[PDB]
Design a protein around this nucleic acid. Structure first.
Ligand SMILES: [K+]
Ligand SMILES: [K+]
Ligand SMILES: [K+]
Ligand SMILES: [K+]
Ligand SMILES: [K+]
Ligand SMILES: [K+]
Ligand SMILES: [K+]
Ligand SMILES: [K+]
Ligand SMILES: [Mg+2]
Ligand SMILES: [Mg+2]
Ligand SMILES: [Mg+2]
Ligand SMILES: [Mg+2]
Ligand SMILES: [Mg+2]
Ligand SMILES: [Mg+2]
Ligand SMILES: [Mg+2]
Ligand SMILES: [Mg+2]
Lengths: 203, 117, 50, 122, 155
RNA sequence: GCGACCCCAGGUCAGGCGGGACUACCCGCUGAGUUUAAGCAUAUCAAUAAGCGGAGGAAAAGAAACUUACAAGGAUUCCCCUAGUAACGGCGAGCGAACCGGGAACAGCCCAGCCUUAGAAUCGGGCGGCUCCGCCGUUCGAAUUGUAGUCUGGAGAAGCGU
RNA sequence: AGUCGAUCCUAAGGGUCGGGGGAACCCCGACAGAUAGCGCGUUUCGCGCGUACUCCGAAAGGGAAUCGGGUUAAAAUUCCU
RNA sequence: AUUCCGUGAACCAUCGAGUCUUUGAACGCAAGUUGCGCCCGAAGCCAUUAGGCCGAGGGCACGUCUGCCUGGGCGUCACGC
């Protein structure tokens, strides 16, 4: 009966209490490495609703990512091409910062499976997420029927194939209908299907 | 607590020797480089025969992985003869050759006759 | 050179062993098509390029 | 005079080791004969002696492995060389029970409303 | 680790603390805390051994004694969910809140809830001490819903 | 000085997991120009080639924060049609879907949160047994900063009857 | 071939942990840090020192030690005395 | 070779038992080096509640998960001095 209280308090982000706590936490995170395990989640309710459980095999890692757009990484900012592509700055990465954080966590921890992630803090330079990961080799995970699906081989590196919640968000799968139809089953798959020239036997 | 050094040093903590529940390898491996594998065959060239006749030395073709200590031990085991010194080289064909000089107590000619050359 | 590594020496030994004519009895085998050693090498014609 | 595998299987470890030593000594003597210019009859025996050595070694190895398997039977954490090989993915696969695990509501649904056997005729 | 844990305390001291968090700096006095905790020590939940012994006795006596009635146990309640439920249902008579809950958003609202429900609450030092009371490593908060007749006056 | 907790450190500690390989299909990122426009810069080539990663036997998608405006359909996927159409475009060169309709196949579900408090009913490891892909007993540990169970909007909780 | 060299040392430099960047292949390189360990006595535990690479990098730099005489068709400061 | 009327030939077929050298993601450190380290240890020699020589054979990478052991810091407390 406390998770609702915690959730509403975290919805109140501009309150003095939240500002003080977030300031202290952001300062502390600024002093530690980019990727670091946390003993327990600092947002228990959010972790619950995203699928975390307080049992062996579940882990949480704080990940820090840099803020801003994606500068085209060409030497001296020189583009050999037409003016339309000559742009260098004000370019944006197609993936989100939380997706980057999940990818960093997954690459660093090759022996685990990235279940989910959530925003925790941010400053002008850095954004902070916590990634929930699962040890698919643990007996508790393998015997829990609600999560042992992650142990199947088809779910390898969900974060790197864009199958997480952030992955679906940046792939455009969070909506349905006339505004999102081109993204299903995938944008490239739709392009291939549309460009295919069908030549039947009897023409 | 009283600290006399400004620098912090990591404290020494106990370490435990491995005590595995199961052995990774079921049984010890076989001894590939036994005496028979070390000593391939004696050399019966003119130079080898001259060495046997003059310097009381036998010439052997030996496994490339064998060292002088192993060669001496293998010769002792096979023929029960002491060795004054073993010299080794690798021929251009890639095989190892060993000049084994027996002690004066042993006759290289008699040893060769027993071996069958 | 006189100074050579063990690996290079072993490779040269293998090349020397491979540089030879085919056995005569190979030509008498039933349904034989090998006439000679097509991979013969001479130290002055083709270098090993090691 | 020829070696029989079924006869070797009835011998003990010490006898097999002694036979292996004798065969190795005979092989060394045959190599000496070959290098000194032995006759074709002696030369042909090299293959037979090598086959005998391989047979004795195989029998010894199989006996030792059978003994180790029997010793480790009905035990967990077997040696890696004795564990089943299969493939990497198959080894990583979940067990049948773990695959079949399901929630209480799913079990209740299966027990209460399974697919019924029915026909459409009358 | 040492440097950062010291600098965190320094920064918390330096920065202005909003009243909601500042209320957790004023804990129960030493004498009152000792009295409260010596009172609580006699309402501790049964440990694993005691639970197993009671369960086996009940199993043994089920058929023989025809399930004799047993008096309802009186023990302290723990667990944030259950404590919040009891406070909301007005069953709680006393609430004890650890002053060092991390993250503190778990209990920062508990004093406000207790005040609104008219449930007396105190802030004490040591979630580890609360956990020791309830046979756990740590306890965010504890609650008393009822007390014994011999202890009603001191309670 | 002792003890409890927190965070962290060292272990060839006991037992596990990961890296790399292949290319036809599949998923994510990054990303041109040749060329066409009878020149050329927006456009086109192309959301392509090249480059960097990640799986399986298929992948991906999937159970409406949908399509429609009808007398209404009803997860996803694919085929025919819609259609070279609506639209986009130095409205130039060119580009270009979706809904309805007919078929192939069809399958639905699991969680978070208020709700044991007459006691975490949950799970992992060691040890000992058994009809050994698991079950039982015992002992340590995880967990109350919440493991089990109920509930998921199509409902559902509680109460009364069949 | 114990004695000739490599092998050992370090030079310009190279390759790295941690940390910082990076979609990633990778980039910087001891610079964001609880270093490796080293001595004394021992119930193998205690005591005392301990500035984040004990890695690669020279058959011409530095550097432990062999000389005559003889010997082969072809080896020798390596074989014989 | 083969009781060729048979535990039995085969440059036969097929697979369940077994062997499987140096490397390589490559894992003690390196590498134009079969170069340079540390640990355990069967058997044997004499050595006797003591240790020595030798060595079959096997171990010592990194990042992580669970559990454990040993520790550090007034980081949060409590009991005594
Ligand atoms: K253009
Ligand atoms: K148990
Ligand atoms: K639940
Ligand atoms: K990094
Ligand atoms: K560095
Ligand atoms: K030198
Ligand atoms: K001399
Ligand atoms: K070296
Ligand atoms: Mg370009
Ligand atoms: Mg230091
Ligand atoms: Mg799929
Ligand atoms: Mg038409
Ligand atoms: Mg249709
Ligand atoms: Mg158990
Ligand atoms: Mg690094
Ligand atoms: Mg050195």
């Amino acid at each position: 009966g406390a998770y609702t209280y915690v959730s509403e308090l975290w919805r109140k982000k501009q309150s003095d209490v939240m500002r003080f706590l977030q300031r202290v936490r952001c300062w502390e995170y600024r002093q530690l490495p980019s990727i670091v395990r946390v003993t327990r989640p600092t947002r228990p309710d959010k972790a619950r609703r995203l699928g975390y459980k307080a049992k062996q095999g579940y882990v949480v890692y704080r990940v820090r990512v840099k803020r801003g757009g994606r500068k085209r990484p060409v030497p001296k900012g020189i583009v050999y091409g037409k003016p339309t592509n000559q742009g260098v700055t004000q370019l944006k990465f197609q993936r989100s910062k939380r997706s980057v954080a999940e990818e960093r966590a997954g690459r660093k921890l090759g022996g685990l499976k990235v279940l989910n992630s959530y925003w925790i803090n941010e400053d002008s330079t850095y954004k902070y997420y916590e990634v929930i990961l699962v040890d698919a080799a643990h007996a508790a995970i393998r015997n829990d029927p609600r999560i042992n699906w992650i142990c199947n081989p088809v779910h390898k590196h969900r974060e790197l194939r864009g199958l997480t919640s952030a992955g679906k968000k940046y792939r455009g799968l969070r909506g349905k209908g006339h505004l999102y139809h081109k993204n299903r089953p995938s944008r490239r798959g739709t392009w291939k299907r549309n460009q295919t020239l069908s030549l039947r036997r009897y023409r | 607590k009283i600290r006399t050094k400004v620098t912090f040093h990591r404290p020494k903590t106990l370490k435990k020797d491995r005590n595995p529940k199961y052995p990774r390898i079921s049984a010890p491996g076989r001894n590939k480089l036994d005496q028979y594998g070390i000593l391939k065959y004696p050399l019966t060239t003119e130079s080898a025969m001259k060495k046997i006749e003059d310097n009381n030395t036998l010439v052997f073709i030996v496994d490339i992985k064998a060292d002088k200590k192993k060669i001496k031990d293998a010769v002792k085991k096979m023929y029960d003869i002491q060795t004054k010194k073993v010299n080794t080289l690798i021929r251009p064909d890639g095989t190892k050759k060993a000049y084994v000089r027996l002690t004066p107590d042993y006759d290289a000619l008699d040893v060769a006759n027993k071996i069958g050359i | 050179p006189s100074h050579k590594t063990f690996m290079i020496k072993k490779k040269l030994a293998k090349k020397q062993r491979q540089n030879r004519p085919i056995p005569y009895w190979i030509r008498m085998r039933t349904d034989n098509t090998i006439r000679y050693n097509a991979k013969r090498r001479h130290w002055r014609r083709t270098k090993l390029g090691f | 005079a020829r070696i029989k595998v079924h006869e070797l299987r009835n011998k003990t470890k010490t006898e097999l080791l002694a036979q292996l030593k004798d065969l190795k000594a005979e092989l060394a003597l045959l190599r000496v004969a070959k290098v000194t210019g032995g006759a074709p009859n002696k030369l042909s025996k090299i293959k037979v002696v090598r086959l005998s050595i391989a047979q004795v070694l195989t029998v010894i190895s199989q006996k030792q492995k059978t003994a180790l398997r029997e010793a480790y039977k009905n035990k967990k954490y077997l040696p890696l060389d004795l564990r089943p090989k299969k493939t990497r993915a198959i080894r990583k696969r979940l067990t049948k029970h773990q695959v079949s695990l399901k929630t209480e509501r799913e079990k209740k649904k299966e027990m209460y409303f399974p697919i019924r056997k029915y026909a459409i005729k009358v | 680790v040492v440097r950062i844990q010291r600098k965190r305390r320094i920064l918390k001291q330096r920065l202005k603390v909003p009243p909601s968090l500042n209320q957790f700096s004023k804990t129960l006095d030493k004498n009152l805390a000792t009295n409260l905790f010596k009172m609580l020590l006699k309402y501790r939940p049964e440990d694993k051994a005691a639970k197993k012994e009671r369960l086996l006795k009940r199993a043994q006596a089920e058929a023989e004694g025809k399930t004799p009635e047993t008096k309802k146990p009186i023990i302290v309640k723990y667990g944030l969910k259950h404590i919040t439920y009891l406070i909301e249902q007005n069953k709680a008579q006393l609430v004890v809140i650890a002053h060092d809950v991390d993250p503190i958003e778990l209990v920062v609202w508990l004093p406000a809830l207790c005040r609104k429900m008219e449930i007396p609450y105190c802030i004490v030092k040591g979630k580890a001490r609360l956990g020791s009371i309830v046979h756990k490593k740590t306890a965010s908060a504890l609650c008393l819903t009822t007390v014994k007749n011999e202890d009603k006056m001191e309670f």
